[PDB]
Write a protein that binds this ligand. Structure first.
Ligand code: CLA
Ligand code: CLA
Ligand code: CLA
Ligand code: CLA
Ligand code: CLA
Ligand code: CLA
Ligand code: CLA
Ligand code: CLA
Ligand SMILES: CCCCCCCCCCCCCCCC(=O)OC[C@H](COP(=O)(O)OC[C@@H](O)CO)OC(=O)CCCCCCCCCCCCCCC
Ligand SMILES: CCCCCCCCCCCCO[C@@H]1O[C@H](CO)[C@@H](O[C@H]2O[C@H](CO)[C@@H](O)[C@H](O)[C@H]2O)[C@H](O)[C@H]1O
Ligand SMILES: CC1=C(C/C=C(\C)CCC[C@H](C)CCC[C@H](C)CCCC(C)C)C(=O)c2ccccc2C1=O
Lengths: 144, 39, 73, 80, 146, 165, 741
């Protein structure tokens, strides 16, 4: 498996437009682009409000935050049994692949994933805040 | 009849009957013994 | 200086009122307590306290105010 | 950013990962349970703090905890 | 509020020369609402009326001021963040799509007050309105009666 | 007597209040006939008022400056001046009925806790068991004292859940 | 395509087996309780028929049987009102003196000193003065004896038994199919023609044959015992011919198109009856005749089983313009498959109609001796207004429920609903701006007036003497209606109401109806009403449009319609569900309607209601509305502080109960503040400590005690808030209007 590359010249689903789309953040900070493959033309619900028609083949959409892209991914996976993927696009043109990060969905275990933020103890074994006091900043006992 | 008695044994019906009995007893006591302030 | 002479029938004055939003009736309405303009009648009881501890004239209050300002600085 | 931590009481049921609405958690191989899997948080910069993962955790007490930390555009879920 | 209500009513009846009024009306809550709150607020609410005003109008204005602050606190106390955040998002869209006004942009992104901040703000308004309302009523009633 | 009060049988304000109540009732009665339902009802209310005032004065209650009866809650003063019927006897009466209710409820919970579905018995009351326990609860103080003396009234600290401190 | 009776035989067996199994309707609740939350859930999902099963036929059958149960309850309530008027009232005595005897239909038992509530209402009777207006309604119907009311009560009990039998028969014996409920064309035809038209025709027949002659003799001064019985009037033509000469010709002028002959009992008098103060019964009878004909005509519009008629689907599909895309496509399927959408539309129009009823009823009093009964008028207006507002909030709630559960994007690609959801941000933003503009320009005027009045500058206030804001449009409309009977209404003898202008009508020394003038204070209170209604609309509309998704939570529809929040994330997502929007809309509706009823009470007691003296009319408050309603201090002092005297000093009299409720209502409302300002985490920990004390004494219940849920806490708080506030206003209004009116 290899990381996919965003194709900016990808057809978008048939939508008449809405007022819940992108804002100035997309032009000044970042935005997100979701792409998927549809077996047939089908009407789905847009996470920003309204009903759009996904075309047969590739489909590309833009959203203001990652939650909208994942909500659309969940809707396409649970209802139409599709496999969507999204990226984070910056105004300079940089594209960053986001989900599924390793090509496999995170709900199923995949080899090569290194565990992060894992504490080899339980909650009851956490120390008291007095032992964490006078640190660099506000730190919780779970951070150590 | 068994199911009806079981329904009558439920908490709201039992509470209604018990409170009606208690309220009736207090009302009848205050009716036959008007204005009781001290023993 | 006038409240110490008759502290039973004279209302203490907190401070003067200078508000350009006041109309004429508000000006004569708040003008009371023997003052020449609109003032506020104090309810903090500092008049009775200062009178009991020994204050009698305005000079004493002025000196105490300057002393407390120096202490604050 | 918020702080998401996984504890050793995790049974690898993958319910927290399926309930995450911003793809913060994932499953990694492990040997401390029957499922041979463990939850992980490698993308905490995208966590908003909805605590859906804590709602989906069946262990007593929870195996995943979310401590609200610094707030940014991503953590506040702002689309503007 | 209960301790100050008791103190003010007992002392008002004492200073007025009729302690029997308090002794006979403090045993039921209707006496507290009518003989102490309704009766002693007549001069307060008459600080300014359509016929003119007197020196007690500032306390009437402060009375209504405290009522307004208290009621404003109830807003932060009852309605919670989510509704306000969605409303603010709609306002953000409206400002971004309005000509002659989109040229002026904010430096900080507008967001709704946090849950803890909302509680603190609602409590601050509640306490300020509470204090100002009782202070205005107590001072106006005691000064007008004597 | 106690606290500078006077007996209601000698208080002038007490008799004045009785006269005032009878006066307003008679004033309302003056607008009706002599053999009608409102007249009979008003006359019954007047007789009840007279009987209530006579019964309160006969009970030995103490009246204040307002002419209203005042209760004595101190057991020493109540037992020394014959005022135990105000606050003492009703205190023990309430304690008996309240402990009765609490003991019957506790017995019902302990009885249904050893069954298959105690929650089902908690929502659907078992009338025969509840009636039997309600009748057997007359000896609640003796049974409670015996349970306390045997050590079966309380639960051990090791069997009660607590927070992690 | 074929409209017929589709019914399944014996679908549900009548048994008591499920009566002993609580929570059987829900799959989750059928397991049994483990915690106390279950109990609350058992009552929170009892009528949520669409949540128990997904079968539309089962939901429709349950709804239809529930409707029969509701009608049975209503019939029992009406039968009780008639029975109370026939056995524990003074209606017969009130008939001989309706201007001095106070209506009463409730008597209390002589226990614990409560007999003081049986006040001297007059007519040698002791009881509670009622404000429902049943006496005036019975007098308008021609009822002169208690036997008629008793017979009506027995008939109501029989009708209630029939309603309950119908519900049982339609749920267990003969249940209609889904295709039977989906016959909207046939149902609308029957409801328009049969129900409404035939009911209006039957009531017109009763008015023509019973109400008109009995009330004519009553207004002429004839004793009720000497007035002939209704069947005597309906049996011979001599009595009716003497009272109405057109009756001598029979029904012949109706068939020969000589309707003008019936002008003696079918008129256009307008105004009010100078003897009773109410509307002319001849006008009401003619009104019902015209309404019956119009509704009967309207009941032949839809297509049922023949070629003639209309298809609502075709009509909806034919309406499409260039600015709305597809149009009403899919609306017919939405309204024929979703009960929540129909409930939303029906509740909205029903609440609006109730408010319209309150306004038309006070302005044009239709019952005899109703206008002079200030207590009944104020109570009726306030009650109908509150019912209307509650139904409107419910309409918003069910619109949101439809959007969350029954909405389908595959049937709304480019319809009106789709476009509305597409530009919901623009809709809500503009409504937010107009709400802020209205709030500033409505409340700021009062604040400015309060400040100017306190600063000793009455010349800078927004009053009639100072800078005025006169409602020129309303005044012009009033003049137009007053001048209508001379140019635009040649057949009308008088105007529709006396509120437009003219002379006043007084009955028994009390002003029944007089012209209502509008000034600066009226302008300010009208803008206050507009602002409050706009804010309520904003909250309900925001909860409906953003029920499925928003910029904060893109998958809100997956969380349902009634959920507490989505966690403290994204800064905090507290109260994002549509349920919470309805929860806040209830408070705003209460605020709006409270100001509305306050304005009505002050305006009526200041410029309309009052006594009539020699060369002048003295009002209840002396006409202080135009001078004191322009400031908040005026509303607090002249309306709230001054008029609350009657309820606070009511102790020791027959109205003392009102005073008690006046205090109790202040308690419940304050009680609400405990649930609205707190959270369930604190209560759960407190319950943990109490459970520890219970475990120590072995008295811990098997059903684990849990604190109320977040949604339940909000519901309890809003319920107590509404109950306390409305009961406070109810006690204050009734005590004041009964003591001084
Ligand atoms: C905890 C507060 C409280 C207390 C201590 C009382 C106490 C009393 N109330 Mg009161 N009341 C209260 C709250 C309270 N009330 C509230 C909140 C309301 C509003 C609903 C009322 C409304 C009210 C009314 C309208 C009346 C009373 C009356 C009475 C007296 C009746 C005694 C009696 O019932 O005979 C004796 C009872 C028994 C013998 C029952 C004994 C139980 C069993 C059968 C025997 C077991 C004993 C061993 C009594 C002194 C009555 C009265 O006359 O006032 C003086 C009366 O008219 N109350
Ligand atoms: C709930 C708190 C409480 C409080 C605040 C009081 C307060 C009082 N009690 Mg008391 N008492 C209580 C509970 C309480 N009691 C209980 C639960 C009982 C049942 C055991 C008693 C039984 C009781 C008796 C028998 C007497 C008092 C008496 C008194 C009064 C003076 C004695 C004293 O202060 O010492 C505290 C009270 C005690 C320790 C109980 C024993 C009494 C002591 C030894 C004092 C008695 C000596 C003498 C009578 C004092 C008065 C001298 C003269 C004026 C006659 C006093 C106002 C006395 C009184 O004034 O008679 C009218 C009295 O003789 N109480
Ligand atoms: C005595 C005759 C009888 C019997 C034995 C049954 C038996 C049954 N019915 Mg049925 N039904 C009846 C008459 C009867 N019904 C009538 C007269 C109606 C018309 C209203 C209905 C309409 C009806 C419907 C729509 C449904 C049932 C259902 C059921 C089944 C389970 C529900 C249940 O009963 O729980 C017990 C429920 C109650 C005891 C609630 C009673 C509520 C009454 C109607 C309203 C009371 C109003 C109250 C006084 C006012 C509130 C004010 C408050 C302060 C008290 C069960 C086998 C349900 C079913 O089959 O599940 C799939 C179903 O949904 N029935
Ligand atoms: C001229 C025919 C007619 C009439 C008079 C009615 C009247 C009524 N319908 Mg109905 N309906 C009809 C035809 C008719 N319908 C047809 C043809 C259909 C199928 C397309 C329906 C389907 C339907 C549904 C789904 C519902 C109603 C409901 C109602 C009631 C509304 C409650 C109300 O506010 O009214 C005022 C209340 C009254 C006037 C009370 C008096 C009631 C008496 C008995 C008149 C009813 C006459 C009616 C035709 C029954 C006679 C049939 C016979 C076998 C007994 C009302 C009584 C609702 C309901 O079920 O309520 C129970 C409801 O949910 N109807
Ligand atoms: C639903 C409304 C309604 C009803 C029920 C009635 C009813 C009646 N009107 Mg009336 N009316 C109405 C509206 C109504 N009206 C309106 C809106 C107007 C204004 C235009 C009028 C104006 C009016 C006038 C001016 C007069 C009446 C009159 C009458 C009475 C006689 C009708 C007649 O002349 O012969 C009509 C004949 C029939 C209706 C046929 C009768 C059918 C019978 C019942 C069939 C029974 C058959 C059955 C099998 C028998 C077997 C019995 C069994 C036990 C064996 C009658 C009781 C007259 C009157 O009362 O005289 C004083 C009269 O003069 N009406
Ligand atoms: C024709 C009128 C109508 C009908 C048929 C329905 C029907 C329904 N509503 Mg609804 N609604 C209505 C009007 C109506 N509503 C109005 C007017 C409002 C505004 C207040 C609402 C607001 C509303 C909300 C916010 C919700 C519903 C929900 C529901 C559904 C679940 C049933 C339920 O509520 O649980 C059972 C019903 C009860 C437990 C009744 C509660 C009892 C109240 C609190 C007592 C009121 C106080 C009382 C008048 C005073 C008594 C004095 C006291 C001392 C005894 C159901 C399909 C719920 C839903 O859709 O589920 C997702 C939902 O949450 N409704
Ligand atoms: C008396 C208390 C109070 C006040 C003042 C407000 C005020 C407001 N509410 Mg609110 N609300 C309240 C109680 C209150 N609410 C409570 C208790 C609840 C819980 C149920 C709610 C729930 C609620 C909801 C759900 C919503 C509002 C909304 C609004 C805003 C409507 C816009 C408007 O009116 O324009 C003008 C503003 C006012 C009239 C407020 C007074 C402003 C004064 C008169 C101006 C003074 C200016 C002065 C020169 C300032 C100088 C200060 C100096 C030191 C420099 C507004 C600011 C709605 C909104 O968001 O707006 C569209 C909205 O959706 N409220
Ligand atoms: C929001 C309601 C409201 C309104 C309408 C007014 C109105 C007024 N106030 Mg007032 N005031 C208010 C609230 C209000 N106040 C409140 C809440 C307070 C308490 C804080 C006060 C306290 C107060 C004081 C102390 C005083 C006033 C005074 C005045 C008067 C002169 C003020 C002035 O000249 O400012 C100038 C106004 C502007 C610079 C802006 C005008 C607004 C323009 C017309 C809006 C433009 C919109 C336009 C249509 C958009 C076009 C779009 C496109 C076509 C281009 C004036 C009639 C003074 C007075 O005494 O009266 C004699 C005065 O001294 N007020
Ligand atoms: C009033 C103007 C009505 C406007 C009106 O109805 O114009 C008429 C216009 C024509 O609609 P259509 O010809 O597409 O209608 C055909 C079908 O809807 C069925 O009739 O409707 C619209 O423009 C929809 C856009 C909403 C209009 C946005 C204006 C928002 C202002 C809201 C507040 C008003 C104050
Ligand atoms: C639309 C049909 C359904 C509604 C049915 C309404 C019918 C109600 C039944 C009661 C009928 C009373 O109907 C009554 O008929 C008699 C017939 O003698 C008329 O009686 C009158 O005219 C007849 C001649 O026609 C005279 O002989 C008689 O002396 C005179 O009283 C009454 O004017 C009418 O009121
Ligand atoms: C007080 C309070 C509670 C506690 C409220 C509770 C526990 C409800 C109490 C209701 C009754 C008293 C519980 C027991 C009902 C029994 C059936 C009563 C049996 C007694 C017999 C006499 C019948 C909350 O749970 C809560 C949750 C969220 C926001 C605010 C609040 C809140 O303010």
């Amino acid at each position: 498996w290899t990381v996919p590359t965003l194709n900016p010249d990808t057809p978008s689903p048939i939508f008449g437009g809405s007022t819940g789309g992108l804002l100035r953040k997309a032009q000044t900070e970042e935005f997100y682009v979701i792409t998927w493959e549809a077996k047939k033309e089908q009407i789905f619900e847009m996470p920003t409000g309204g009903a759009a028609i996904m075309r047969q083949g590739p489909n590309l959409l833009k959203f203001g935050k990652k939650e909208q892209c994942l909500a659309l991914t969940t809707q396409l996976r649970n209802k139409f049994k599709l496999t969507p993927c999204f990226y984070r696009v910056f105004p300079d043109g940089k594209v960053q692949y986001l989900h599924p990060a390793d090509g496999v969905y995170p709900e199923k275990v995949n080899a090569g994933r290194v565990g992060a933020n894992q504490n080899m103890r339980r909650i009851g074994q956490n120390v008291n805040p007095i032992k964490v006091k006078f640190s660099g900043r506000m730190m919780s006992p779970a951070e150590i | 009849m068994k199911d009806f008695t079981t329904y009558l044994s439920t908490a709201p019906v039992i509470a209604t009957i018990w409170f009606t009995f208690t309220a009736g007893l207090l009302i009848e006591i205050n009716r036959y013994f008007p204005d009781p302030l001290v023993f | 200086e006038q409240w110490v002479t008759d502290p039973v029938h004279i209302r203490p004055i907190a401070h003067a009122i200078w508000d350009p939003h006041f109309g004429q009736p508000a000006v004569e309405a708040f003008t009371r307590g023997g003052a020449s303009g609109p003032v506020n009648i104090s309810t903090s009881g500092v008049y009775q306290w200062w009178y009991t501890i020994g204050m009698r004239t305005n000079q004493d209050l002025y000196v105490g105010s300057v002393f407390l300002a120096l202490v604050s600085a | 950013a918020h702080i998401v931590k996984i504890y050793d009481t995790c049974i690898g049921c993958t319910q927290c990962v399926r309930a995450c609405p911003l793809d913060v958690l994932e499953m990694v191989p492990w040997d401390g349970c029957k499922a041979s899997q463990m939850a992980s948080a490698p993308r905490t910069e995208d966590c908003v703090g909805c605590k859906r993962c804590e709602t989906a955790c069946p262990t007593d007490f929870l195996s995943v905890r979310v401590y609200l930390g610094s707030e940014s555009t991503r953590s506040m879920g702002l689309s503007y | 509020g209960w301790v100050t209500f008791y103190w003010h009513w007992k002392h008002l009846t004492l200073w007025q020369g009729n302690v029997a009024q308090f002794d006979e009306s403090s045993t039921y809550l209707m006496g507290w609402l009518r003989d102490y709150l309704w009766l002693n607020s007549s001069q307060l609410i008459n600080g300014y009326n359509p016929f003119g005003m007197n020196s007690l109008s500032v306390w009437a204005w402060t009375f209504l001021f405290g009522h307004l602050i208290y009621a404003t606190g109830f807003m932060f106390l009852i309605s919670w963040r989510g509704y306000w955040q969605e409303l603010i998002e709609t306002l953000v869209w409206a400002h971004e799509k309005t000509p002659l006004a989109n040229l002026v942009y904010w430096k900080d992104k507008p967001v709704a007050l946090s849950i803890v901040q909302a509680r603190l703000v609602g409590l601050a308004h509640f306490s300020v309105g509470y204090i100002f309302t009782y202070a205005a009523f107590l001072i106006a009633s005691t000064s007008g009666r004597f | 007597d106690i606290a500078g009060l006077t007996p209601c049988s000698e208080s002038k304000a007490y008799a004045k209040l009785e006269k005032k109540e009878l006066k307003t009732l008679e004033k309302r009665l003056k607008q009706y006939e002599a053999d009608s339902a409102p007249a009979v009802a008003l006359k019954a209310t007047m007789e009840r008022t007279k009987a209530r005032f006579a019964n309160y004065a006969k009970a030995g209650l103490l009246c204040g400056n307002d002419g209203l009866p005042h209760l004595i809650a101190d057991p020493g003063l109540a037992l020394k001046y014959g005022h135990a019927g105000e606050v003492f006897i009703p205190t023990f009466g309430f304690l008996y009925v309240a402990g009765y209710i609490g003991y019957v409820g506790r017995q019902y919970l302990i009885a249904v806790k050893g069954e298959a579905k105690p929650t089902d018995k908690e929502i659907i009351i078992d009338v025969p068991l509840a009636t039997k326990l309600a009748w057997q609860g007359a000896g609640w103080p003796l049974a409670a004292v015996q349970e306390l003396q045997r050590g079966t009234l309380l639960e051990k600290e090791e069997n009660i859940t607590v927070s992690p401190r | 395509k074929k409209v017929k009776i589709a019914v399944d035989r014996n679908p549900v067996e009548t048994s008591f087996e499920k009566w002993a199994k609580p929570g059987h309707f829900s799959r989750t609740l059928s397991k049994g309780p483990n915690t106390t939350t279950w109990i609350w859930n058992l009552h929170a999902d009892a009528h949520d028929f669409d949540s128990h099963t997904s079968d539309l036929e089962e939901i429709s059958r349950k709804v239809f049987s529930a409707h029969f149960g509701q009608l049975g309850i209503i019939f029992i309530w009406l039968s009780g009102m008639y029975f109370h008027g026939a056995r524990f009232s003074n209606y017969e005595a009130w008939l001989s003196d309706p201007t001095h005897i106070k209506p009463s239909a409730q008597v209390v038992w002589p226990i614990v000193g409560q007999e003081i509530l049986n006040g001297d209402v007059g007519g040698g009777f002791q009881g509670i003065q009622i404000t429902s207006g049943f006496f005036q309604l019975w007098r308008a119907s021609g009822i002169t004896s208690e036997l008629q009311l008793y017979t009506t009560a027995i008939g109501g009990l029989v009708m209630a038994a029939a309603m309950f039998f119908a519900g049982w028969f339609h749920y267990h014996k003969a249940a209609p199919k889904l295709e039977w409920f989906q016959n909207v064309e046939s149902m609308l035809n029957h409801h328009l023609g049969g129900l409404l038209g035939l009911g209006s025709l039957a009531w017109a027949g009763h008015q023509i044959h019973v109400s008109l002659p009995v009330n004519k003799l009553l207004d002429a001064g004839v004793d009720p015992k000497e007035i002939p019985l209704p069947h005597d009037l309906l049996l011979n033509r001599a009595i009716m011919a003497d009272l109405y000469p057109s009756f001598a010709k029979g029904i012949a002028p109706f068939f020969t198109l000589n309707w003008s002959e019936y002008s003696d009992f079918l008129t256009f008098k307008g105004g009010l009856n100078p003897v009773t103060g109410g509307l002319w019964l001849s006008d009401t009878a003619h009104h019902h005749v015209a309404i019956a004909v119009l509704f009967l005509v309207a009941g032949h519009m839809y297509r049922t089983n023949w070629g003639i008629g209309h298809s609502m689907k075709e009509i909806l599909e034919a309406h499409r313009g260039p600015f709305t895309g597809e149009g009403h496509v899919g609306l017919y399927e939405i309204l024929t498959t979703s009960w929540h959408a129909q409930l939303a539309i029906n509740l909205a129009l029903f609440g609006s109609l109730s408010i319209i009823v309150a306004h038309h009823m006070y302005a044009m009093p239709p019952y005899p001796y109703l206008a002079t009964d200030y207590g009944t008028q104020l109570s009726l207006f306030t009650h109908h207004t509150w019912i209307g507002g509650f139904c409107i909030v419910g309409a918003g709630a069910h619109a949101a429920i439809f959007m969350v559960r029954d909405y389908d994007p595959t049937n709304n690609y480019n319809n009106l609903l789709d476009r509305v959801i597409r530009h919901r941000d623009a809709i809500i933003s503009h409504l937010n701006w107009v709400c802020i503009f209205l709030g500033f320009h409505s409340f700021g005027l009062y604040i400015h007036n309060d400040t100017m009045s306190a600063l000793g500058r009455p010349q800078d206030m927004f009053s009639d003497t100072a800078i005025q804001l006169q409602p020129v449009f309303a005044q012009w409309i009033q003049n137009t209606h007053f001048l209508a009977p001379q140019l635009t209404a040649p057949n009308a003898l008088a105007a529709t109401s006396l509120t437009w202008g003219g002379d006043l009508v007084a009955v028994g020394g009390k002003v029944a109806m007089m012209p209502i003038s509008l000034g600066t204070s009226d302008f300010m209170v009208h803008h206050i009403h507009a602002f409050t209604i706009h804010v309520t609309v904003l909250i309900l509309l925001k909860g409906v449009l953003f029920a499925r998704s928003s910029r904060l939570i893109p998958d809100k529809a997956n969380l349902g319609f009634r959920f507490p929040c989505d966690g403290p994330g994204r800064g905090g997502t507290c109260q994002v569900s549509a349920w919470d929007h309805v929860f806040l809309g209830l408070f705003w509706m209460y605020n709006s309607l409270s100001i509305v009823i306050f304005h009505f009470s002050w305006k009526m007691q200041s410029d309309v209601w009052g006594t009539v003296t020699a060369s002048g009319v003295s009002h209840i408050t002396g006409g202080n509305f135009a001078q004191s309603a322009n400031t908040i201090n005026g509303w607090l002092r002249d309306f709230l502080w001054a008029q609350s005297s009657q309820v606070i000093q009511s102790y020791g009299s027959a109205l003392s109960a009102y005073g008690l409720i006046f205090l109790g209502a202040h308690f419940v409302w304050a009680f609400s503040l405990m649930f609205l300002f707190s959270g369930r985490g604190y209560w759960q920990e407190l319950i943990e400590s109490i459970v520890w004390a219970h475990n120590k004494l072995k008295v811990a219940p098997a059903i684990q005690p849990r604190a109320l849920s977040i949604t339940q806490g909000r519901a309890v708080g809003v319920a107590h808030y509404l109950l306390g506030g409305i009961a406070t206003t109810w006690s204050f209004f009734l005590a004041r209007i009964i003591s001084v009116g």
